[PDB]
């Protein structure tokens, strides 16, 4: 049911990097990873939490639809794309932390905790600031646990509306062509060691879906593009994408 494939380490080593990729073949109900230990190591989710946060915001009416505008608060932040109005689609694309921090404040700690329990999400612990616990609080989730959560989202089985799940899956759209569709979210955990990058989501094929979750050590922001590059080398090797 789980296979270790250490050959994927080469993709990591060729970029002087260390990390884990986890794949799940939905049709065959079989998982593969280069590191069975790290595949099950729980880390801060960082911006991958915008997936559950979006779902909860939509289901509780904090976000009405994917077109509602959240106006910039006028504070100039480091990331230039954040210094403008956003909707749910662009806030996911540009990973606009302050938008989601306000979502979390409006959700509140009681409802946030109850929903993460209902979602079976990671260690289910929201200790910390209600508007930053996914960055520097108590919540921890492993790559295999991310896959468990994403599979429920794919099949509309989370304990929120079908509509909320469809809208979040739309907002996760990252790449599509005549071979595949990727729906995914990146994450970058810098506030608490060890600094890591994430990419989690799935690849839709004509006749199967392959779920993925990867994380890797990320001592500087220079290597953020390796999150997608290394994952794509694995997907290419496994003939999931050409
Ligand atoms: C764009 C991002 C990405 O692609 O990861 C990062 C930089 C962004 O998304 B989160 O992962 C996050 C958390 C704190 C701060 C922060 F700027 C981010």
CB 126 within 8 A of CB 104: no
For ligand 1, residues with CB inside 6 Å are 46-47, 79, 95, 97, 135, 186-188
Q: Count of domains in the chain?
A: 1
Query: Helix, strand, or coil here: 213?
Result: strand
| Local structure of residue 184 (DSSP, 8 states) | E
Handedness of CA 128, 134, 135, 141 (dihedral sign): positive
Closest by alpha carbon to 148, among 170, 119, 173? 119
Method: X-ray
CA distance 136 to 98: 15
Task: Look up the domain containing 100 and give its range.
Answer: 1-242
For 182-204, give one letter per residue: b (16+ CB within 10 A) or e. bbbbbbbbbeeeebbbbbbbbbe
List Cα–Cα distances, 150 to 83, 139, 163, in angstroms. 30, 17, 16
Closest by alpha carbon to 151, among 235, 25, 62, 61? 25
Active-site residues: which are they?
47
Closest by alpha carbon to 197, among 90, 13, 44? 44
State the alpha helices, DSSP H only, in 60-208: 88-93, 97-107, 109-118, 133-136, 143-154, 162-171
Closest by alpha carbon to 37, among 22, 16, 48? 22
**Stated resolution in angstroms:** 1.5
Which pair of tokens denotes residue 42? 């729980």
| Local structure of residue 141 (DSSP, 8 states) | B
Residue with CA closest to ligand 1 atom 6: 188
Ligand 1 pocket mutation pick from 186, 195, 223, 227 by most atoms within 8 angstroms of CB? 186
Q: Domain containing 92 — which CATH number?
A: 3.40.710.10
Burial class (CB in 10 A: 0-12, 13-18, 19+), 41: middle
CA distance 146 to 23: 11
Q: Give the helix/strand (H/E) hosting 51.
A: helix 50-59
Ligand 1 pocket mutation pick from 47, 51, 201, 226 by most atoms within 8 angstroms of CB? 47
List Cα–Cα distances, 42 to 38, 125, 146, 198, 211, in angstroms. 8, 12, 10, 12, 18
Edge to edge, the sheet with strand 2-4 lists 2-4, 30-33, 19-25, 209-217, 196-204, 181-189, 173-176
């Amino acid at each position: 049911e789980w296979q270790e494939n250490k050959s994927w380490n080469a993709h990591f080593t060729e970029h002087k990097s260390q990390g884990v990729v986890v794949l799940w073949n939905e049709n065959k109900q079989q998982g593969f990873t280069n590191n069975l230990k790290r595949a099950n190591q729980a880390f801060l989710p960082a911006s991958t939490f915008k997936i559950p946060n979006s779902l909860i915001a939509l289901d509780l009416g904090v976000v009405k639809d994917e077109h509602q505008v959240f106006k910039w608060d006028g504070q100039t932040r480091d990331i230039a794309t954040w210094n403008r109005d956003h909707n749910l689609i662009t806030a996911m694309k540009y990973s606009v932390v302050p938008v989601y921090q306000e979502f979390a404040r409006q959700i509140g700690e009681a409802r946030m905790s109850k929903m993460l329990h209902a979602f079976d999400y990671g260690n289910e612990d929201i200790s910390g600031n209600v508007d930053s616990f996914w960055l520097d609080g108590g919540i921890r989730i492993s790559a295999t646990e991310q896959i468990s959560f994403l599979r429920k989202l794919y099949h509309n089985k989370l304990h929120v509306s079908e509509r909320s799940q469809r809208i979040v899956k739309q907002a996760m759209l990252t790449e599509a062509n005549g071979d595949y569709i990727i729906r995914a979210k990146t994450g970058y955990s810098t506030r608490i060691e060890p600094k890591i990058g994430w990419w989690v989501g799935w690849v839709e094929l004509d006749d199967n879906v392959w779920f993925f979750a990867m994380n890797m050590d990320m001592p500087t922001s220079d290597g953020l593009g390796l999150r997608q590059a290394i994952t794509k080398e694995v997907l290419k090797q496994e003939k999931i994408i050409p």
